[PDB]
Amino acid sequence: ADTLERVTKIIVDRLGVDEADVKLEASFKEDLGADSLDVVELVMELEDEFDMEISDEDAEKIATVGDAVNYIQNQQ
């Protein structure tokens, strides 16, 4: 609930560009054209929002940025 919307504000406001590029099924690089840095970089600020241990290996090896969102619900 607050997690998704929270991450959505972080992802969208960041990799969303015009509020739409954000996509869980997207690899955050070839789908909505995103830089691997800003991508996992946005998931790092995300780990600080809900206090998580997402490292650069998470957002990168994670099934998808969305899984990162699912990663937060797994801690709640």
CATH of the domain at 75: 1.10.1200.10
CB 65 within 8 A of CB 39: yes
Cβ neighbours for 6, distance < 8 A, ≥ 6 positions apart: 46, 49, 50
DSSP-assigned states of every residue in 48-76: HHTT----HHHHHHSS-HHHHHHHHHHH-
Report how far apart, in Å, the C-alpha atoms of 50 and of each of 12, 14, 17, 24, 66 are. 17, 17, 22, 18, 15
Domain count, the chain: 1
2, 13, 18, 35: the active-site residue: 35
Report how far apart, in Å, the C-alpha atoms of 70 and of each of 3, 18, 52, 57, 59 are. 9, 23, 12, 16, 12
CB 23 within 8 A of CB 39: no
Check if 21 is active-site.
no
Among left, alpha and beta (phi > 0; psi -120 to 50; other), residue 62 is beta
Helix, strand and coil content of the chain, in percent to the nearest 5, comes to: 60, 0, 40
CB 30 within 8 A of CB 37: no
The parent domain of residue 2 ranges over: 1-76
